């Protein structure tokens, strides 16, 4: 009932690229810490037990070393098939305790979002709704910021944004963003603008409609 | 070889109880000690209860101390997680393990809430069939307000897989609200049919909307 803090939190690296993973205890552990792979879609899986033990049929690559409250998994020329989520765990006391993890992800040419934007559909509109949707599509890097303007103006209230993982074929990435609006309060105005800062560029990426082309 | 094969995930109320499962196959259960442990959906590992080969010495976290009840049968090579007095805190994927954990099962989702099980609805997103321009129009599909998780999409019945993109699940206050993209080249534009699909296993729902690149 100890804290296992891992570091970092999220890796981009390219493969071939050496990496360490720390873990470290908040308070001495000896070597009673044990290390887990987790892949999308599939449970955890031993790498590592007692600090430096790497389990058979692990490959050399793979190694980890410390004692007392620090320990590293060091992975030498990453694979493609070693992106994933690492864990730290630690037997020492109970309850059995865990680190948050660490996200290993696969650094790519950088890749500007294709955005696409949506009016409402007529059948939303019947529910007396109105989403307005944009897609940001296949990106890289992840950081990406959307502004929405109604009429010029900005407009922060009411949007949700969803991210995906990294494309398993690509590793761009996707986020979709959507301004949830009373039906009513959508027929107020006529232009919704959907603006994309990407990395990739200096102006921002922008689509927009107007209550217009039917 | 070593199997683990968890079950009796599901949602339930809070304040109501379950009984999770775990078949073990491939070893000699009895030597072995086991334990469930949990992933929260911010992906967070917590263990839960560990239980010895011969099931005397059980230990438990202070969390669930009094609620939980770890048992085993060495004779039918179950593993058994009894959970009383359930907390929406509770809600995560629940593994199991054989011992660190060298081997762990296929988890089984156990989701504790008020909410109650709600079909979404599915609306086509058709460009503004102007606000275009290439070989590559992006159609799409919201699914709004349903519960719980999950939802299959589809585009076209499968076939369409090159493509498209789901996202993930948005709680807006006990209703999920769901997107999905496709591209396809402006052929099909109304060209051709471009149908969304999607199905809630637990409302037993399959709806089909078809998109087309169409309305104004």
């Known amino acids: 009932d100890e804290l296992l803090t891992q570091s970092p939190a999220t890796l981009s690296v390219t493969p071939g690229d050496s990496v360490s993973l720390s873990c470290r205890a908040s308070?001495?552990?000896?070597?009673?810490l044990h290390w887990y792979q987790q892949k999308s879609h599939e449970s955890p899986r031993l790498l590592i037990k007692?600090?430096?033990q790497s389990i058979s049929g692990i490959p050399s690559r793979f190694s980890g070393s410390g004692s007392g409250t620090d320990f590293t998994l060091s992975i030498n020329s990453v694979e493609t098939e070693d992106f994933g989520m690492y864990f730290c765990?630690?037997?020492?006391?109970?309850?059995?305790?865990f680190g948050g993890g660490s996200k290993l992800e696969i650094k790519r040419a950088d890749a500007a979002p294709t955005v696409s934007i949506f009016p409402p559909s007529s059948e939303q509109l019947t529910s007396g709704g109105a989403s307005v949707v944009c897609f940001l599509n296949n990106f890289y890097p992840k950081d990406i910021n959307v502004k929405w303007k109604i009429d010029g103006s900005e407009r922060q209230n009411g949007v949700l944004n969803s991210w995906t993982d990294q494309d398993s074929k690509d590793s761009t990435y996707s986020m979709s963003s959507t301004l949830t609006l009373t039906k009513d309060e959508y027929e107020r105005h006529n232009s919704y603008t959907c603006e994309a800062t990407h990395k990739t560029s200096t102006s921002p990426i922008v689509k927009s409609f107007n209550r217009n082309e039917c | 070889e070593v199997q683990l094969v968890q079950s009796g995930g599901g949602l339930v109320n809070p304040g109501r109880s379950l009984k999770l499962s775990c078949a073990a196959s491939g070893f000699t259960f009895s030597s072995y000690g086991m334990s469930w442990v949990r992933q929260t959906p911010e992906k967070r590992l917590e263990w839960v209860a560990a239980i010895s080969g011969g099931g005397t010495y059980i230990h438990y976290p202070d969390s669930v101390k009094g609620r939980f009840t770890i048992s085993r049968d060495n004779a039918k090579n179950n593993l058994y997680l009894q959970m009383s007095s359930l907390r929406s805190e509770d809600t995560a994927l629940y593994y199991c393990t054989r011992h660190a954990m060298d081997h762990w099962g296929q988890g089984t989702s156990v989701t504790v809430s008020a909410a109650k099980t709600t079909p979404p609805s599915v609306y086509p997103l058709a460009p503004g069939s102007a606000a275009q321009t290439n070989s590559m129009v992006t159609l799409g599909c919201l699914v709004k307000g349903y519960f719980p998780e999950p939802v299959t999409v589809t585009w076209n019945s499968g076939s369409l897989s090159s493509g498209v993109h789901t996202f993930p699940a948005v709680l807006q206050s006990d209703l999920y609200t769901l997107s999905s993209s496709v591209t396809v080249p402006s052929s099909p534009r109304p060209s051709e049919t471009v149908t969304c699909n999607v199905a809630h296993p637990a409302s037993s729902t399959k709806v089909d909307k078809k998109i087309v690149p169409r309305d104004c």
């Open positions: 765990q630690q037997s020492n006391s109970w309850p059995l305790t």
């Open positions: 308070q001495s552990i000896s070597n009673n």
């Open positions: 007692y600090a430096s």
